[PDB]
């Protein structure tokens, strides 16, 4: 909405009170949108135990496809938007404006895969607030969608070559970053909570989780036509908001149906000392900021 | 297919506090919930409360809320009835019933609360 | 509340005939719905849930039909152990409030 010239801006997307507040309007909204039957949520120190708050409401079945999230500046502040194809979200930009909002953002909710997001416009991308640390969570940005189909009857649907191929992109990528002349394997999720584990989303108000074994098991760099991957509605949920259980009721439709396009993955690099070469990468996620941060990257907030 | 049994009859003086206890034999106890139900002599069936036993989330009847607690031990699938300051017509067999829920260990859970077992039932008398 | 109201209170049947049983709410409950029976001195046996759903171990002369605020239970044809008294129970409202009805006593007819 205006092209700054002779103009050098510093960005920091790892510092971006946008991410923050998109987060809390996210969150916000699906509290208000999607409400549990049963709401455990743990409250400390106090005394000597951890009383914990339940809240017991009625939990209408409420399912619809989240429309997009336009981000505007707030009274006092300004949007700067990089103009660069491919960018970094780090340090100096020259091709860069003012906008009134940033572009629609469709809220989903997920791990390991980012779904329905947008697409880069050159090459495949990969971002980390710290690549040399192994626990920041790495997030890949694909320039080409990958179709995934779910459904309520238990499972999702992916071309094996379509994905074959956009691995190939990354583990490229990877051995990018990380050294030519190193190894770049796939492996499932190490642990932790089904949600971090399993490929879990939204769809239908229902909550998927998804065994993704199958699309992380490969060495690159050293079949079967559609990969159909397990899956569980389940009703008992660890929030993502706040640290809590929640219990949603059981479905009351027949046909649940999910065609998404992954767009974007949220990666984790094993590491650790091994003078042995080679790099192995599992499927992260958890931290919805992480998910905001992957479309939010190219903007920042500026007192006027 | 678990099996329920309660404890023995208790006989308790108006304003007195009863605590009925039920042991949950053969099966996965945070699979199933459990649901208090009473019935007066010459009288029908009283929903008492129920709980989600592994949330440990108990809810109950409006007409009997702050006087009565429902509770469960995980260790030795035991479920507990607690009646706060009891009256004569409070008088009543209290039963103890559960259904299975799903493989709620794994997130699924059906929230049924319809009840396929039962105890033998505890009586429990409130007078002078 | 979710009141539950039962008909007739008595059912005098004739031995290996046929008995219907009336169960009315204050409002709708979709088919969350549960019939069970009792005997003199022992704990009820759940018969039907789901509105019509038999249970495991339930024959099936057993059958129960309706939805929303209109229940019915069925026995085609009456054993001398099917006379007894029985309740319905709806559980379909959250927070969970759930009412029994007042029973049904049925009894032999001679």
């Known amino acids: 909405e205006v092209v700054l010239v002779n103009v050098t801006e510093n960005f920091n997307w790892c510092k971006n009170d946008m991410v923050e507040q998109m987060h809390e309007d996210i969150c916000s909204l699906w509290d208000q949108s999607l409400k549990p039957c049963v709401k455990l949520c743990p409250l400390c120190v106090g005394a000597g135990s951890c009383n914990t708050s339940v809240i017991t409401q009625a939990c209408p079945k409420v399912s619809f496809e989240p429309i997009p999230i336009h981000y505007c500046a707030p009274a006092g502040f300004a949007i700067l938007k990089c103009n660069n194809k491919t960018f970094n979200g780090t340090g100096p930009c020259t091709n860069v404006s003012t906008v009134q909002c940033t572009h629609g953002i469709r809220p989903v909710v997920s791990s390991q895969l980012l779904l329905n997001g947008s697409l880069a416009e050159e090459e495949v991308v990969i971002r980390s607030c710290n690549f040399t640390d192994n626990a920041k969570t790495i997030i890949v940005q694909l320039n080409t969608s990958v179709e995934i189909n779910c459904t309520g009857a238990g499972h999702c649907n992916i071309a094996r070559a379509k994905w074959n191929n956009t691995l190939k992109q990354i583990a490229s990528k990877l051995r990018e970053q990380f050294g030519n002349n190193k190894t770049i394997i796939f492996k499932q999720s190490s642990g932790g909570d089904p949600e971090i584990v399993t490929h879990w989303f939204n769809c239908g108000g229902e909550f998927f989780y998804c065994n993704s074994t199958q699309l992380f098991n490969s060495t690159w760099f050293n079949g079967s036509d559609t990969i159909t991957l397990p899956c569980r509605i389940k009703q008992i949920i660890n929030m993502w908001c706040k640290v809590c259980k929640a219990m949603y009721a059981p479905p009351i439709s027949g046909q649940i149906r999910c065609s998404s396009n992954i767009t974007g993955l949220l990666l984790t690099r094993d590491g650790g000392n091994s003078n042995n070469e080679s790099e192995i990468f599992r499927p992260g996620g958890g931290d919805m900021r992480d998910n905001w941060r992957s479309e939010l990257y190219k903007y920042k907030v500026v007192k006027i | 297919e678990v099996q329920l049994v309660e404890s023995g009859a208790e006989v308790k003086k108006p304003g007195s506090s009863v605590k009925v206890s039920c042991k949950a034999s053969?099966?996965?106890?945070?699979?199933?919930?459990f649901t208090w139900v009473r019935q007066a002599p010459g009288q029908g069936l009283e929903w008492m409360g129920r709980?989600?036993?592994?949330?440990?989330?108990?809810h109950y009847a409006p007409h009997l809320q702050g006087r009565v607690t429902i509770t469960a031990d995980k260790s030795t699938s035991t479920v507990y009835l607690e009646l706060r300051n009891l009256r004569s017509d409070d008088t009543a067999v209290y039963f103890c019933a559960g259904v299975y829920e799903g493989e709620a260990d794994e997130g699924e859970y059906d929230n049924n609360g319809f009840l396929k077992h039962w105890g033998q039932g505890t009586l429990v008398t409130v007078s002078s | 509340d979710i009141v539950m109201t039962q008909s007739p209170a008595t059912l005098s049947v004739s031995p290996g005939e046929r008995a219907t049983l009336s169960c009315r709410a204050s409002?709708?409950?979709?088919?969350?719905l549960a019939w069970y029976q009792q005997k003199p001195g022992q704990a009820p046996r759940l018969l039907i849930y789901?509105?019509?759903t038999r249970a495991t171990g339930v024959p099936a002369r057993f059958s129960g039909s309706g939805s929303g605020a209109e229940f019915t239970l069925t026995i085609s044809s009456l054993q001398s152990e099917d006379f007894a008294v029985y309740y319905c129970?709806?559980?379909?409202?959250?927070?969970?409030?759930?009412?029994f009805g007042q029973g049904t006593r049925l009894e032999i007819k001679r």
């Open positions: 409002e709708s409950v979709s088919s969350d």
């Open positions: 789901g509105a019509s």
């Open positions: 709980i989600i036993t592994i949330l440990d989330v108990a």
């Open positions: 129970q709806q559980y379909n409202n959250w927070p969970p409030r759930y009412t």
């Open positions: 053969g099966d996965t106890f945070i699979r199933y919930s």
